[PDB]
Amino acid sequence: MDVVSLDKPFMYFEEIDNELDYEPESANEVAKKLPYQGQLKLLLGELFFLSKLQRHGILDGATVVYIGSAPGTHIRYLRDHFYNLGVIIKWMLIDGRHHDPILNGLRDVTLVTRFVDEEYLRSIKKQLHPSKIILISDVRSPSTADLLSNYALQNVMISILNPVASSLKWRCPFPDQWIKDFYIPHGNKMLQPFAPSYSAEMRLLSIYTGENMRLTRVTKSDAVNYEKKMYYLNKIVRNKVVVNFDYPNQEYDYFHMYFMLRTVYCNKTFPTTKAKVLFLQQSIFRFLNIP
Amino acid sequence: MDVVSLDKPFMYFEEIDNELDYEPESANEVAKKLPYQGQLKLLLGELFFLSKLQRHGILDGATVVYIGSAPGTHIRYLRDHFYNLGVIIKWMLIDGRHHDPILNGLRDVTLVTRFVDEEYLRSIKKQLHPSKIILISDVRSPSTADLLSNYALQNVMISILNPVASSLKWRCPFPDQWIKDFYIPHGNKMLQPFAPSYSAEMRLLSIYTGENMRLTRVTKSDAVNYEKKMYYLNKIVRNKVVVNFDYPNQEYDYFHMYFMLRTVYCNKTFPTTKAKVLFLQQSIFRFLNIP
Ligand SMILES: C[n+]1cn([C@@H]2O[C@H](COP(=O)(O)OP(=O)(O)O)[C@@H](O)[C@H]2O)c2nc(N)[nH]c(=O)c21
Ligand SMILES: C[n+]1cn([C@@H]2O[C@H](COP(=O)(O)OP(=O)(O)O)[C@@H](O)[C@H]2O)c2nc(N)[nH]c(=O)c21
Ligand SMILES: Nc1ncnc2c1ncn2[C@@H]1O[C@H](CSCC[C@H](N)C(=O)O)[C@@H](O)[C@H]1O
Ligand SMILES: Nc1ncnc2c1ncn2[C@@H]1O[C@H](CSCC[C@H](N)C(=O)O)[C@@H](O)[C@H]1O
């Protein structure tokens, strides 16, 4: 067995302290080990992101604009969680694809069947006015050409919507498929437990203070780094069994999930962080029909 | 006579401490009082900007890419000034219009007859590589539609060229001609002595540290402010005769010019700032054929 003792898991890209040469044969290995793993991946990251905003007092009263939301099964869990905590939020889920019917019939959630373009962003901005907007983006076109176009749309979402915070899908183009350098918004590169086995995807979390918008350039050298750091994390780290983690499941992803879940607010009072997390995890797995 | 005593002049937009309601009849008033006033306006601002970079030690060894440079008569003065000071710089002047022949025959200056587009910016970036670039932009299309397009090109100049510093033309669209909010690079809003009598134009000066790029949103309310602050400056301030300014010419613009010129480096040693400035001014006016 692949055992180890860890203090904490890597929460952000910058914390990864090692790298490995990407082995293309990794692409043929089992990408997922749990049913509905993708909904689980998104649920944890967005619960993490949103709980942070709650902590900073910027969630209550906001309209969450989620673009690239369908099917959005896991989003029903997020909505219930904050709704039950007393936080007042409106959800606007937009995708050209159809949403899970469990999202219908909630006055606080508006489903829109539309593929957004810059012009539409303008109309909804005029229509949301004057609410404070929190943007979540998971749009998907993939070539490096596709990625750049998605990233370009994500930056236009921020400039038109002008949100108070944002969570954006972020996967650096592969160095061997580099086209040109580009800019992404400045934010924390939140790592994702339960991401596919060798995925290099993370989420970019940002909070917008003032009327400024800070971007950061991404080059091929950065692309080389992303590949090696993420490859090291996926191949080595995520395959570890953290034996000094007293929890029903000690695999790295559960250890990593534990640290995100420990930041979530509940109505129920618990005697230990371990009890709250076990509760939230049980709750999350039951909702998603994960054994 | 319109007399007053002033400590210093307003160097940046933010310093303007008063405003006036824009009177449209001002548009019919004499816009210029000196021959070649436009070359003088550009010369002082760019001498100011470039001397600053020298002070920060980022000028020597740079390639100055000036887009919207023709005719560029005043640019010959700038080139000579730094060339004579021993600073090593290469100039690349690009405009679809033709440059003043006084700029020909200098190995350190390359004239390009081209209207730049994003693609061309890419090729020159590949060709300038690996020199450090200082961008100066004075491109001109004007409707608010024209402005936005120019500003959009200016931001693409920065993202493709990725300069160490930049000076950009900046005039906020008039509130009564507002189209949409937009972003401009963050920088100092340098005010311009000898600008047309009622011009609301200034120059945006920026220095790029790290791999980040900070932008700032401009709204109609900002547009209302620009109009009133600039109107107050043009109508009231610039019409002042600073009587406690011991200088051959006490009009506000000369007082303002004095503060920019006092920051310029010379080979000749002077006993007082007043002597250096008088020298630089005499020199500048003689070069431009201004009496
Ligand atoms: C993690 N990774 C994956 N691939 C390629 O990406 C293809 C699709 O797998 P993926 O990258 O997991 O898809 P996604 O990121 O769109 O969700 C695989 O078949 C590999 O060829 C990769 N190709 C390169 N060059 N470098 C990498 O780090 C890398
Ligand atoms: C300074 N100013 C000028 N204009 C208009 O701008 C026209 C051209 O004059 P300009 O603004 O000096 O041109 P420029 O900025 O392109 O160099 C004038 O005929 C006026 O109608 C202005 N119009 C408005 N609404 N507000 C202003 O502050 C203002
Ligand atoms: N312009 C656009 N506007 C809206 N959705 C977009 C888009 N372009 C692509 N997408 C959507 O991006 C999605 C990527 S998959 C998203 C999964 C979803 N976030 C979840 O919670 O289940 C697809 O449903 C796709 O239709
Ligand atoms: N795409 C582009 N590339 C180059 N020059 C441009 C441009 N679009 C407009 N311009 C130029 O912008 C200039 C504005 S007037 C500039 C005056 C000049 N800076 C001076 O020193 O004399 C015009 O010469 C015009 O041809």
Q: Annotated binding site of B for mRNA, which residues?
A: 22, 171-174, 176, 199-201, 227
Is residue A48 within 8 A of residue A262, CB to CB? The reply is no
C-alpha distances out from residue B38 to A240, B71, B92, B100, Å: 68, 11, 21, 15
Of the candidates A24, A5, A14, the one whose C-alpha atom is nearest the C-alpha of residue A235 is A24
Cα gap A200→A191, rounded to integer Å: 9
Residues in chain B: 291
The token pair at B111 is 């004239």
Tokens (6 digits) for A167: 């969570």
Q: Which amino acid is at B163?
A: P
CB distance B171 to ligand 2 below 6 Å: yes
CB-CB neighbors (< 8 A) of A211 in chain B:
216-217, 219
How far apart (Å, rounded) are the C-alpha atoms in residues B50 and B58?
A: 9
Single-letter residue type at B107: R
For chain B, how long is the longest CA-to-CA vector? 57
Residue found by looking up tokens 């904490």 in the block: A8
For residue B95, give the nearest of B151, B140, B147, B126 by alpha carbon. B140
Q: Note whether B91 and B99 are within 8 A (CB).
A: no
Q: By three-state DSSP, how is residue B265 classified?
A: coil
B55 CB neighbour count, 10 Å cutoff: 11
Q: 3-state class of B50 per DSSP?
A: helix
A chain contacts of residue B183, beta-carbon cutoff 8 Å:
159, 213
Contact A64, A54 (CB under 8 A): no
Cα of B91 from ligand 4 centre, angstroms: 15
Cβ distance B214 to A214 less than 8 Å, yes or no, reads yes
Cα separation, B10 vs B24, in Å, equals 24
Rounded CA-CA distance A99/A93 in Å is 8
Distance from CA of A212 to the nearest CA of B (A): 4
Query: Are the C-beta atoms of B207 and B167 separated by less than 8 Å?
Result: no
Mutate to test the interface with B, among A118, A213, A218, A221 (most CBs of B within 10 A): A213
| Residue among B244, B250, B247, B276 nearest B263 (CA) | B276
Determine the Cα–Cα distance for residues B103 and B94; give it in Å rounded to an integer. 12
For tokens 């006579």, the residue is B1
List, in sequence order, every residue forming a beta bridge with A4; answer none if it has no partner: A242
For ligand 2, whether the C-beta of B146 sits within 6 Å is: no
CA–CA dist B46, B74 (Å, integer): 10
Contact assessment for residue A218 and residue A183, using Cβ atoms and an 8 Å cutoff: yes
Q: Choose among A183, A214, A219: nearest Cβ to B159.
A: A183
- Which of left, alpha, beta for B13 (phi over 0: left; psi -120 to 50: alpha)? alpha
> What SS3 state is found at B181?
coil
Give the Cα separation of B81 and B103 in Å (integer): 14
Q: How many CA atoms lie within 13 A of B113 on its CB side?
A: 6
Nearest chain A CA: its distance from B209 CA (Å):
11
Q: Fold for domain A1-291? A: Rossmann fold (3.40.50)
**Which two tokens mark A179?**
């086209």
If you ran DSSP here, which 8-state letter would residue B54 be given? H
**Peptide bond preceding A130: is omega within 30 degrees of 0, i.e. cis?**
yes
Distance A95 CA to ligand 3 centre (A): 5
Token code pair at residue B155 = 């931001």
Whether residue B211 lies within 8 A of chain A, CB to CB, comes out as yes
Residues 6+ apart with CB under 8 A from A212: B186, B214, B215, B216, B217
Residue B210, both tokens = 């790290």
Q: Is B33 a catalytic residue?
A: no
**Interface contact A177, partner B, CB < 8 A:** no
Task: Find the closest chain A residue to B162 by CA distance.
Answer: A217
Per the CB < 8 A criterion, the answer to whether B160 and B118 are in contact is yes
Which DSSP category does B100 fall into?
P
Q: What is the token pair recorded at B182?
A: 């937009």
Stated as kind and residue range, the H or E segment containing B241 is strand B241-242
Q: Do A215 and B217 touch (CB under 8 A)?
A: no
Q: Which two tokens stand for residue B153?
A: 């090109």
B168, B154, B135, B159: which is closest to B213 by C-alpha? B159
Q: Which chain B residues are within 8 Å of A126, Cβ to Cβ?
A: none
The closest of B207, B217, B158, B172 to B187, measured between CA atoms, is B207
Which residues in chain B have their C atom more than 2.5 Å from the N of the next written residue, marking a break after them?
A: 141
Residue with tokens 């800070």: A214
Instruction: Give the three-state DSSP class for B112.
Output: strand
Q: Which residues have a Cβ under 8 Å from the Cβ of A43 and sit 6 or more positions away?
A: A74, A77, A78, A284, A288
> In this complex, how many residue pairs, one in chain A and one in chain B, have their CB atoms less than 8 Å apart?
42
Specify the DSSP element, H or E, that contains B111.
strand B109-113
Q: Is the dihedral of CA A40, A46, A52, A55 positive or negative?
A: negative
The string over B193-232, giving b where at least 16 C-beta atoms fall within 10 Å of a residue's C-beta and e elsewhere, is: bbbbbbebebbbbbebeeeebbbbbbbbebbbbbbbbbbb
Q: Is residue B179 within 8 angstroms of chain A, CB to CB?
A: no
Question: Within chain A, what is the greatest distance between any pair of CA atoms?
Answer: 57
Give dist(CA A64, CA A138) in Å, integer: 13
Is the separation of the CB atoms in A189 and A202 below 8 Å?
Answer: yes
Distance CA A103, CA A77 (A): 10
In this structure, are strands A212-218 and A182-185 parallel, antiparallel, or unpaired?
antiparallel
Alpha carbon A45 to chain centroid distance?
4
Shortest CA gap B214–chain A (Å): 4
| Cis geometry, peptide bond prior to residue B71 (ω within 30 degrees of 0) | yes
Question: What residue of A is the nearest CA neighbor of B119?
Answer: A180
A139 pocket-lining for ligand 3 (C-beta < 6 Å): yes
Q: Is B123 on the interface with A (CB under 8 A)?
A: no
Distances (CA, A) of A102 to A76, A86, A111: 7, 21, 11
Of A186, A213, A219, the CB nearest to B183: A213
Question: At how many degrees (to 10) do helices B73-84 and B37-55 cross?
Answer: 30
CA distances from B20 to A66, A91, B210, B228, B235 (A): 44, 44, 39, 5, 8
CA distance A155 to chain B (A): 12
Task: Read off the tokens for A228.
Answer: 């090696």
Helix (H, G, I), strand (E, B) or coil at B224: helix
Question: If you count them, how many residues does chain A have?
Answer: 291
Residues 73-112 (A) with a CB less than 8 A from some CB of B: none
Nearest to A118 by CA among A154, A147, A94: A154
Q: Are strands B212-218 and A212-218 parallel, antiparallel or unpaired?
A: antiparallel
Which residue do the tokens 């920065």 mark?
B158
- SS3 letters for chain A? CCEECCCCCCCEHHHCCCCCCCCHHHHHCCCCCCCCHHHHHHHHHHHHHHHHHHHCCCCCCEEEEEECCCCCHHHHHHHHHHHHCCCCCEEEEEECCCCCHHHCCCCCEEEEECCCCHHHHHHHHHHHCCCEEEEEECCCCCCHHHHHHHHHHHHHHHHHHCCCEEEEEECCCCHHHCCCCEEEECCEEECCCCCCCCCCCEEEEEECCCCEEEEEEECHHHHHHHHHHHHHHHHCHHHCEECCCCCCCCEHHHHHHHHHHCCCCCCCCCCCHHHHHHHHHHHHHHHHCCC
CB A151 within 8 A of CB A218: no
- Domain parsing of chain A, residue ranges: 1-291
Residue bearing tokens 């909505």: A79
Question: Which residue does chain A place closest to B222, by CA atoms?
Answer: A211
Residue A200 annotated in ligand binding: yes
Beta-bridge mates of residue B204: B168, B189
Nearest to A98 by CA among A71, A77, A137: A71
User: What distance lies between CA B4 and its chain's CA centroid?
Assistant: 27
Strand pairing of B241-242 and B3-4?
parallel
Residue type, A20: L
Could you tell me the resolution of this structure in angstroms?
A: 1.8
Q: A227 CB less than 6 Å from ligand 1?
A: yes
Q: What is the DSSP string of B130-179?
A: TSEEEEEE------HHHHHHHHHHHHHHHHHH--SEEEEEE-PPPGGG--
**Residue B190, SS3 per DSSP:** strand
Residues B245, B250, B256, B257, Cα dihedral to 10°: -110
Residue B182: closest CA among chain A residues belongs to which residue?
Answer: A159
Pairing verdict, β B202-207 and A188-190: unpaired
Between the CA of residue A74 and those of A7, A158, A189, B145, B180, what are the distances in Å?
30, 24, 22, 43, 36
